[PDB]
Amino acid sequence: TYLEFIQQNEERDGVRFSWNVWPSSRLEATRMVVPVAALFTPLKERPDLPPIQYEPVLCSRTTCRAVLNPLCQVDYRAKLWACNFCYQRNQFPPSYAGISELNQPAELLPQFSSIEYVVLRGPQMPLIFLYVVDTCMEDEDLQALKESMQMSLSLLPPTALVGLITFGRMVQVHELGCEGISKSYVFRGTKDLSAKQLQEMLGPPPSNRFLQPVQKIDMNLTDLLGELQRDPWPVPQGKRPLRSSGVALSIAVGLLECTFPNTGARIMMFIGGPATQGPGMVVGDELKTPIRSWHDIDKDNAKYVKKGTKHFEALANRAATTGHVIDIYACALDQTGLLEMKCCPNLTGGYMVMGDSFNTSLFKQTFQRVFTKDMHGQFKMGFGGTLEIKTSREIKISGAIGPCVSLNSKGPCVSENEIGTGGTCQWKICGLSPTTTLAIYFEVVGGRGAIQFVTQYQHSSGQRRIRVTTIARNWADAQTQIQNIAASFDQEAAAILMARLAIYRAETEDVLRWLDRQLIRLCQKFGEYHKDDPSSFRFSETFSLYPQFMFHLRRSSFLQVFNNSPDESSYYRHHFMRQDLTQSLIMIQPILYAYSFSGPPEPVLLDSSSILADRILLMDTFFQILIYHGETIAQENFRHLLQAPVDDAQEILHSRFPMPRYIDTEHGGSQARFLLSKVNILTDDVSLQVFMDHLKKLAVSSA
Amino acid sequence: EGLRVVNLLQERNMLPSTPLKPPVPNLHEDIQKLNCNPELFRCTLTSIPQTQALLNKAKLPLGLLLHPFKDLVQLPVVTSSTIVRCRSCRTYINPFVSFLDQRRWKCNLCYRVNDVPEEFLEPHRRPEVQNATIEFMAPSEYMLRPPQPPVYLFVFDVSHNAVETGYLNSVCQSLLDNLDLLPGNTRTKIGFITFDSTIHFYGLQESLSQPQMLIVSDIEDVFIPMPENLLVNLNESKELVQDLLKTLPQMFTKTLETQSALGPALQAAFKLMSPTGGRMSVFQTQLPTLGVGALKPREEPNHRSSAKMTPSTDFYKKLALDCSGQQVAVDLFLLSGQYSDLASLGCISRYSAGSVYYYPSYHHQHNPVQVQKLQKELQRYLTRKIGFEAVMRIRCTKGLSIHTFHGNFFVRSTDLLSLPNVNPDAGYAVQMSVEESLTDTQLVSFQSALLYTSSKGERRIRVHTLCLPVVSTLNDVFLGADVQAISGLLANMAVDRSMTASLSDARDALVNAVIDSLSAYRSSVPGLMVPFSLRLFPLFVLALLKQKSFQTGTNARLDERIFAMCQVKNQPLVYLMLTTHPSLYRVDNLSDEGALNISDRTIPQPPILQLSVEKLSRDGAFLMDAGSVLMLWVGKNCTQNFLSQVLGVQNYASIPQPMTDLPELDTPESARIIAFISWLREQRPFFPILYVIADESPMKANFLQNMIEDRTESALSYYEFLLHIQQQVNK
Amino acid sequence: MVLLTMIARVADGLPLAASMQEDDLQQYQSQAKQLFRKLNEQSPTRCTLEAGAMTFHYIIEQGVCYLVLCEAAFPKKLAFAYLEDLHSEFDEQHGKKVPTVSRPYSFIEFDTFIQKTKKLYIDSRARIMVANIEEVL
Numbered sequence A: 001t002y003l004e005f006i007q008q009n010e011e012r013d014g015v016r017f018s019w020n021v022w023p024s025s026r027l028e029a030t031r032m033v034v035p036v037a038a039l040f041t042p043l044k045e046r047p048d049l050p051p052i053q054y055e056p057v058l059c060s061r062t063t064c065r066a067v068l069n070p071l072c073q074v075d076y077r078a079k080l081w082a083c084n085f086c087y088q089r090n091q092f093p094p095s096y097a098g099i100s101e102l103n104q105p106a107e108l109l110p111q112f113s114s115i116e117y118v119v120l121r122g123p124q125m126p127l128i129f130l131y132v133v134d135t136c137m138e139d140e141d142l143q144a145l146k147e148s149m150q151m152s153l154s155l156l157p158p159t160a161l162v163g164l165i166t167f168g169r170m171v172q173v174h175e176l177g178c179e180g181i182s183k184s185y186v187f188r189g190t191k192d193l194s195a196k197q198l199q200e201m202l203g204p205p206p207s208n209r210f211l212q213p214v215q216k217i218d219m220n221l222t223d224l225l226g227e228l229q230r231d232p233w234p235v236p237q238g239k240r241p242l243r244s245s246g247v248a249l250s251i252a253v254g255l256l257e258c259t260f261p262n263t264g265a266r267i268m269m270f271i272g273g274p275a276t277q278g279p280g281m282v283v284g285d286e287l288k289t290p291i292r293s294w295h296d297i298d299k300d301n302a303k304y305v306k307k308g309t310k311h312f313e314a315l316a317n318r319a320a321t322t323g324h325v326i327d328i329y330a331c332a333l334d335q336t337g338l339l340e341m342k343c344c345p346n347l348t349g350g351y352m353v354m355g356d357s358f359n360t361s362l363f364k365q366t367f368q369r370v371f372t373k374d375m376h377g378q379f380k381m382g383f384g385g386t387l388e389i390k391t392s393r394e395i396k397i398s399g400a401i402g403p404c405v406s407l408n409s410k411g412p413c414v415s416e417n418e419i420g421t422g423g424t425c426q427w428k429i430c431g432l433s434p435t436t437t438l439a440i441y442f443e444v445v446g447g448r449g450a451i452q453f454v455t456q457y458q459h460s461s462g463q464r465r466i467r468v469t470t471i472a473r474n475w476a477d478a479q480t481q482i483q484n485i486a487a488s489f490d491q492e493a494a495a496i497l498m499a500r501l502a503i504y505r506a507e508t509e510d511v512l513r514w515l516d517r518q519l520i521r522l523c524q525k526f527g528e529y530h531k532d533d534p535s536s537f538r539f540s541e542t543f544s545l546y547p548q549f550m551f552h553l554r555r556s557s558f559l560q561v562f563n564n565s566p567d568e569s570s571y572y573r574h575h576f577m578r579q580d581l582t583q584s585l586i587m588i589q590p591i592l593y594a595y596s597f598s599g600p601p602e603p604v605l606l607d608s609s610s611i612l613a614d615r616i617l618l619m620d621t622f623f624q625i626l627i628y629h630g631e632t633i634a635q636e637n638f639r640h641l642l643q644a645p646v647d648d649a650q651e652i653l654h655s656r657f658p659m660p661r662y663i664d665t666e667h668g669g670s671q672a673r674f675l676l677s678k679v680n681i682l683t684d685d686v687s688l689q690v691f692m693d694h695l696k697k698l699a700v701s702s703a
Numbered sequence B: 001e002g003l004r005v006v007n008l009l010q011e012r013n014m015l016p017s018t019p020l021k022p023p024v025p026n027l028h029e030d031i032q033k034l035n036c037n038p039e040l041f042r043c044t045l046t047s048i049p050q051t052q053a054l055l056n057k058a059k060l061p062l063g064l065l066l067h068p069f070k071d072l073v074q075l076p077v078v079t080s081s082t083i084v085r086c087r088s089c090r091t092y093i094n095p096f097v098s099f100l101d102q103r104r105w106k107c108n109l110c111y112r113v114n115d116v117p118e119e120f121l122e123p124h125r126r127p128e129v130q131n132a133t134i135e136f137m138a139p140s141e142y143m144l145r146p147p148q149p150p151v152y153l154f155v156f157d158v159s160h161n162a163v164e165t166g167y168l169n170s171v172c173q174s175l176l177d178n179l180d181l182l183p184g185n186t187r188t189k190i191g192f193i194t195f196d197s198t199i200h201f202y203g204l205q206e207s208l209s210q211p212q213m214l215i216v217s218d219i220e221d222v223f224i225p226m227p228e229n230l231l232v233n234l235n236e237s238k239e240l241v242q243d244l245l246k247t248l249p250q251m252f253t254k255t256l257e258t259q260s261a262l263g264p265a266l267q268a269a270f271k272l273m274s275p276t277g278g279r280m281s282v283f284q285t286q287l288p289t290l291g292v293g294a295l296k297p298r299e300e301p302n303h304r305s306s307a308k309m310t311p312s313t314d315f316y317k318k319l320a321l322d323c324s325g326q327q328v329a330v331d332l333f334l335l336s337g338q339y340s341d342l343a344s345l346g347c348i349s350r351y352s353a354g355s356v357y358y359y360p361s362y363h364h365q366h367n368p369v370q371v372q373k374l375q376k377e378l379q380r381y382l383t384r385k386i387g388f389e390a391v392m393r394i395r396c397t398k399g400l401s402i403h404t405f406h407g408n409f410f411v412r413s414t415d416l417l418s419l420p421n422v423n424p425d426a427g428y429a430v431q432m433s434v435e436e437s438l439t440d441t442q443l444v445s446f447q448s449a450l451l452y453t454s455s456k457g458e459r460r461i462r463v464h465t466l467c468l469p470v471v472s473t474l475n476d477v478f479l480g481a482d483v484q485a486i487s488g489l490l491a492n493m494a495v496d497r498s499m500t501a502s503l504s505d506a507r508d509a510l511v512n513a514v515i516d517s518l519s520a521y522r523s524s525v526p527g528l529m530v531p532f533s534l535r536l537f538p539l540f541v542l543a544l545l546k547q548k549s550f551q552t553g554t555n556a557r558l559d560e561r562i563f564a565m566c567q568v569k570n571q572p573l574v575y576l577m578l579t580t581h582p583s584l585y586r587v588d589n590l591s592d593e594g595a596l597n598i599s600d601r602t603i604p605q606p607p608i609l610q611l612s613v614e615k616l617s618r619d620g621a622f623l624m625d626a627g628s629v630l631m632l633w634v635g636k637n638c639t640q641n642f643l644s645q646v647l648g649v650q651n652y653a654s655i656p657q658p659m660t661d662l663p664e665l666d667t668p669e670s671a672r673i674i675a676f677i678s679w680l681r682e683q684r685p686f687f688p689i690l691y692v693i694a695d696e697s698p699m700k701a702n703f704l705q706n707m708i709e710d711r712t713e714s715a716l717s718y719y720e721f722l723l724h725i726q727q728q729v730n731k
Numbered sequence C: 001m002v003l004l005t006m007i008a009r010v011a012d013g014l015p016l017a018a019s020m021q022e023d024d025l026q027q028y029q030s031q032a033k034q035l036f037r038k039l040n041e042q043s044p045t046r047c048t049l050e051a052g053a054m055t056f057h058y059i060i061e062q063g064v065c066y067l068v069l070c071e072a073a074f075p076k077k078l079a080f081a082y083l084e085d086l087h088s089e090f091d092e093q094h095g096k097k098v099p100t101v102s103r104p105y106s107f108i109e110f111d112t113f114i115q116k117t118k119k120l121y122i123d124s125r126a127r128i129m130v131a132n133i134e135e136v137l
């Protein structure tokens, strides 16, 4: 079963390919509609794998150096194995001398094709958490942020380092525990500082005067954080507070760049509004002029966007090169400037949380998801990851899309045609979780080809780990080229891998045009039809869902930015470029459930025909969980119904990282708009029925 | 008295045994009794010359020396709703006006007739005419802004060397003991800044568990980090500043900051005080080397170096003028152990009406003299009265023109002096000249008005008026000469000559001043003949040439000579004389010829001796009054009765080496010497420490440096000085 | 917004209390003293004056004038509320001694209450007659 195959492969190797059978001929490889690509999750959890506490045992060839895997041919007599990538024959190390057939190493069993090693390079560095706190906000918002911080401070490992940077009009680097005075370093939030400058102006496990262990400081910090007060400078009438977020961040980056470079560190920046002063300015201090919108940026009425973005873009590279994570937690009624600051959590593995106020159940709970621990009381986050991908000599890498930066490492596996962050065999992911998913795009130049994903990262325990995943997919039999390929198509994976491409070109500019030419080309190669007869068009069960996915994608909030704020668009795209397949599907096409007296909860269609008056709905957009009460039910048996969706909601309303906004509305309420909008150029669309009619009118015509 | 001529080569004992008194101007009995106090206001020539030709012939300088803000025993305060001032020259109504029509008075400075307003009513019995020294209440138009509050911003250096000196402890302990005694009401504001490589502000809020230290490290671009709690209200934050003063000395014990950013730190302090003004106290301990205002090191001279002074940069001069404009005064406390270019640093106080204080090689253990000296000098400094945003005007009758000012201030338009602060221990001097012949009048007058804001927020004006008669004979000019005032105005002129030319020309000008005046007197009449008013002129000018300001063949260093010059330019005349020509007494045999009138205390009055070792005696002990200190020298063969009954010691060998003061033993000998010492230090507001360390071998016999009549390997004796002058008088 | 507060005795214009912070003041302080001179027993008890970018506001109670200046953009509603808080405190503390004093600024120590009340109105996160001043002068 091709479905059981896709499931089990994503369960074991945490990967979802668009094609599980690959073209064996250059003619079909060039004429590939949806490219061969993978939805790869390097740190996916699974039924408790055995952590390997020895060296991974590489191949003996300067160019290859691939890891021993279940695809290698072993000779238990000669103590020799043959590399499956370069055919080089290797001697078993002395540690493997007593190798036996009836008792073979873990890295050779097909069950451990994806396996993790524990390596020791030296002393385990402690974790680093740098709080960068905005003080230009109301007291209720500031006090709540203080309560959220003291909560996160209590979950940290004692060995971990902490530092506090508060800011408003000025930027204060706090030196903690100096007894009797409690001092800080004040800087001007109007001019940017480099790292060498910041090192000059400021000056057994290591620790600075500003980054001290929690165990020795958690008491002076929890008293400083409790005495924090709003930015002391007045805010005159009709003005915004002078908020120097661009400089506050560059000082946070610069501080860690000269003290703990190339080590796991988390820069957590908390914002209560836009940056109104210094580099990276998002808007002036005049409340008369509103923050830019998508309309203003299209009509050239936003003079701070380009200049502001470049500043934060230079900091994102500075932090990603050094290897540190930048999180952004924005809570404010107005916009905040996520569009200009998106690159900091996007190039790194940083989080981006959004909300209206730090004094909400929405933010408070979301923030503690960051510090969720596993079966050993340790954080579900890694740091300083290096992903290297080994391919067969016939496969080349076009590039990756997702939270990563190129290490610009050349080799025979690098493809000329690059896509996204391409032109390399190695990428750096400063932050990752068991959820972080990348999108690797490949190019083809008894069968079977293989790809090896090697990810070396720093575990929250301090150990250094290497995760090796080796997969193999069959080469297409030349007597059944397109027939085998057609049967191995992952319509869900391809849809997200194609959405990944469209959103990437949109956020770095038509895009809908390319998305429609590829939908038609896919219909014209793998669909059955007679020429000039639209009625004749059918799609295999392998392809039938692709058009519906493409229907919701081109209308989704990821490619139609208007009706959303620029911060909302970047936030939506931020999470879609990191999530796995199941969550990425929910984003593009929300899931719907029906609740009525006539039957248990059931999944229905995203069509206005499902909005019944005598029925309660439960729509799952990844960003919001909604419960709709029809005009009838909008008034013990009537209690089982009104709380059936509220019960099913709470379950999923906790596992998801960015806690989706909860909504309770009914027919006539102003909040039912979110349901009526997700319901229902080339391939100009009204609704799905018309979309398919037009799609078939163009598929059966000239190609 | 005496209209008699003196032959200095035969007398050689012309210094009287009793203290010198300021000459009485040759005025009518009813005018002199109303004349101003000579301590507050005095002139070098009590008989003003009539023509400039006459003044030039005399070869003597004409000028005034004033101590306008001195503490008074009784001060009349006039609260008149109108200040009677001449409608032309704005001179205040003074005792020496001429009432004619009884409703019209003639101004004694511009001769204009003015109308007495109805309110002033016998108008000659008004207190404004019965007192030369008087303090008014300034109206609404005599202040540019509401009375500024008293602001006290202390600025501490906390480099590695500063922490070694240990000065911070006593300074903080002095501020603790004198916190309720700072001048001011509930409006009093206080502040603190420490600095080294970076400027450190200190916030004080009652909502916080402790003060907060805010460090600005941008040296090339300083700013104020917080707008509210940096200059706090002393009355409300009393408990907070106390904890900070108890904590400040303990914060830097282990510092490695070897450099100090003096320049940028004052720019910060200036910005902090600019909105209001006040008194900026600066404590520096070493050469500034980091940031703007950095100064290069200098090699100290030796005895062998000739006379070959000026600031190395104008940074601290420009900053002082910026403080002046904002009614900020800077007082510089230099506790340096090595050269620090005080010639440059001092400009921060000279042009901002501050005052510099010097404690060479301060150390909390090694130098106990500088500790108790700083202790007592901080006592006066913190408790003495103060005035803020002050100006001063010196007016003199038509014909006389002021042309040179001396003192710590900034001269705006001529005759206008800007005093950001005014302290009751500053002296000022002026040099004037006859611009128009005084054939008309036979009396002249001089007035000084001090418009200042009191520590209680009351804009006050203190006015002094001096009247002097005009003469037309050369001999009448000499008869009214004030030798001490001449020495003072000469000392000030010689300081400028050092900056403008060199130390050589300054010394030559001082010697030529005695030659040219006595040569002019000789032409106007064998030995060295001088008038009675100039018998002590070559002695004092000699003592000037041996003072640390102008001495040559001494091992004196750069910051020593500069500070001596600062004291010449900022001290009243009385203390310039006490330092230059100390008063010597023998105190091992005091008796009852004293002023035993002060009820139960005798207070012996021993005769004054001249500054020559030939007057000493190894058999007794001698106390020397140098104004600032009372060095008690004990002889080797001293009497046994003086050892046990006065020193509490059984032999000369067991006299404690650093003896910081005398013991108050229960003996009539100790009762007499403690009665005479306590009477000397009561004549001044700056308590002088008395150290008897001056044994015959304490390596601290600078007591002999003040024997200005004797010779040394690099200076003439008093008899050799007289011989040098006589050869030049009759060349 | 910004600040300028002066309290004067209307009969003669004798200054009572004030409060000024810069880091010009010389021009508008004079105008404030020109107005105190013109104010008499026929002047409006509550009035507002326009001085271009600046705007004066004052009240008169017990022969005492409470004048404030700020940028015209400052709410006139908040200006008179700031003056009301000053009068009720000043009349309660010194209202009976005003007609007796004769020194300029005999109530300087009111500097503290003026400034602590001042900040409660010049910060948004804490919450009659009109004529050109040039006419009355």
Ligand SMILES: [Zn+2]
Residues within 6 Å of the ligand: A059, A060, A061, A064, A065, A066, A083, A084, A085, A086, A087, A088
């Ligand atoms: Zn190999």
Ligand SMILES: [Zn+2]
Residues within 6 Å of the ligand: B086, B087, B088, B089, B090, B091, B107, B108, B109, B110, B111, B112
């Ligand atoms: Zn006159």
